[PDB]
C-alpha cells in the first residue's frame, strides 16, 4: 500500500500543468480557423481566375 500510494507522489504538481497546457493546445487554434476562412476564400479566388 506504501508503494501504491507513492506512485501518486508528484502527480498533482505535474497534472496541474497537464490540464492547463492540454486545454491551451486544444483551444488556441481559432486563429487557425479564421485563417482557414481566408485560405478557402483565396482558394476560390484562384479557382475562378483559373476559370477566366
Amino acid at each position: 500500500r506504501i508503494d501504491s500510494v507513492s506512485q501518486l507522489q508528484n502527480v498533482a504538481e505535474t497534472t496541474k500543468v497537464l490540464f492547463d497546457v492540454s486545454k491551451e493546445t486544444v483551444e488556441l487554434e481559432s486563429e487557425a480557423f479564421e485563417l482557414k476562412q481566408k485560405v478557402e476564400l483565396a482558394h476560390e479566388a484562384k479557382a475562378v481566375l483559373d476559370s477566366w
Partner: protein
C-alpha cells in the same frame, strides 16, 4: 469535449477500497503493542506465585509438581491413615 479529470480524485476515494479497511485496522493495531518484551512482570510474589513462576510457566511446564501434589496426597491421605486406620 474538454480536458476530463481523473488524476486527482484520490482524496475522497480512499475510504471504500479494501486496503483502506486493513490500513485503518493495523495502524490502530501497531501503536499500543509493547516494543521489545517490555512490562512482562518477571518478578511477582503472593506467597504462592513463586511456585507458579518456577514451575508453571511455559519454560519448565513439567507435571512433576503434580507429582509433589500427589506426594502431598501421600502427605495427606497416608496421614489420614494415621488419623483413621
Amino acid at each position: 469535449v474538454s480536458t476530463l479529470i481523473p488524476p486527482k480524485v484520490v482524496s475522497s476515494k480512499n475510504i471504500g477500497s479494501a486496503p483502506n479497511a486493513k490500513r485503518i485496522a493495523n495502524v490502530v493495531h501497531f501503536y499500543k503493542s509493547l516494543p521489545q518484551g517490555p512490562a512482562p512482570a518477571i518478578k511477582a510474589n503472593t506467597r504462592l506465585a513463586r511456585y507458579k513462576a518456577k514451575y508453571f510457566d511455559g519454560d519448565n511446564a513439567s507435571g512433576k509438581p503434580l507429582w509433589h501434589f500427589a506426594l502431598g496426597i501421600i502427605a495427606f491421605g497416608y496421614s489420614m491413615e494415621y488419623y483413621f486406620h
